[PDB]
Specification:
This is part of a larger assembly, with chains A and B. Chain A is an all-alpha fold. Chain A has 5 helices and no strands. In chain A, helix 4 (about 65-75) packs across helix 5 (about 85-100). Chain B is mainly α. Helix content of chain B is about 35%, strand content about 0%. The relative contact order of chain B is 0.11. Classes of the chains: A mainly alpha, B mainly alpha. Chain B: This is Portal protein. Chain B: It is found in: Virion; Host cytoplasm. Chain A: This is Gene product J. Chain A: Keywords: Host cytoplasm, Late protein.
């Protein structure tokens, strides 16, 4: 997963996270595996939206992707009855992921070293070996 | 023995060839430049001007390449 539960419980108040999680567990006591599973599902969502033009086991993780995983995990964790703002922000992050997949916006870099994640060649052409090109310094 | 040339200057005639004088062994053996590879009119003018000033090497190599390359020529 892109973001750990210790970050989702920091961006979103831990008490509200416990309130959301405690029903979903089998026993009925605050649990941590539910949040990790939701974060894994959100990371899978982002991975699917990024694999279009990136090598998906990201060499360097864009620093905004932690936020983009936390928001989607929060929406996935409020599926029974979400606030209007939660839905609006989830639609905004889906729009951002669609723009990233299309090519309108790059995901960003790692804020530590400003390195952008690599990916496979979106465009690739092959032609026959070049003959009579200007690089052939013979003749002329 | 002091044979005079056409201009009437006496000298001594030697049977040894001038190139085979044991002093011009490293200047009579030159590997050709082939300057006609990627010629630009600026560079052709430069070699022509160098030949005009006196250094005829580049002009001669260029002429040789023109003779062997351009079939109609």
């Amino acid at each position: 997963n892109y973001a750990t539960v210790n970050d989702l419980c920091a961006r979103y108040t831990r008490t509200r996270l416990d309130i959301l999680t405690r029903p979903k567990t089998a026993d009925g006591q605050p649990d941590d595996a539910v949040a990790e599973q939701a974060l894994a599902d959100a990371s899978a969502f982002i991975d699917g939206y990024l694999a279009a033009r990136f090598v998906l086991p990201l060499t360097v993780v864009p620093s905004l992707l932690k936020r983009q995983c936390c928001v989607v995990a929060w929406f996935y964790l409020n599926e029974s009855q979400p606030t209007e703002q939660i839905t609006a922000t989830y639609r905004d992050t889906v729009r951002w992921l669609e723009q990233v997949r299309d090519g309108k916006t790059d995901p960003g870099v790692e804020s530590r070293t400003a390195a952008s994640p690599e990916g496979e060649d979106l465009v690739q052409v092959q032609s026959d070996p070049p003959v009579f090109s200007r690089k052939q310094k013979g003749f002329i | 023995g002091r044979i005079l040339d056409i201009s009437g200057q006496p000298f001594d005639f030697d049977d040894e060839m001038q190139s085979r004088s044991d002093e011009l062994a490293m200047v009579m053996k030159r590997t050709q430049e082939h300057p006609s590879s990627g010629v630009t009119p600026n560079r052709a003018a430069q070699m022509l001007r160098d030949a005009e000033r006196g250094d005829l090497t580049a002009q001669a190599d260029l002429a040789f390449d023109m003779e062997e390359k351009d079939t109609h020529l």
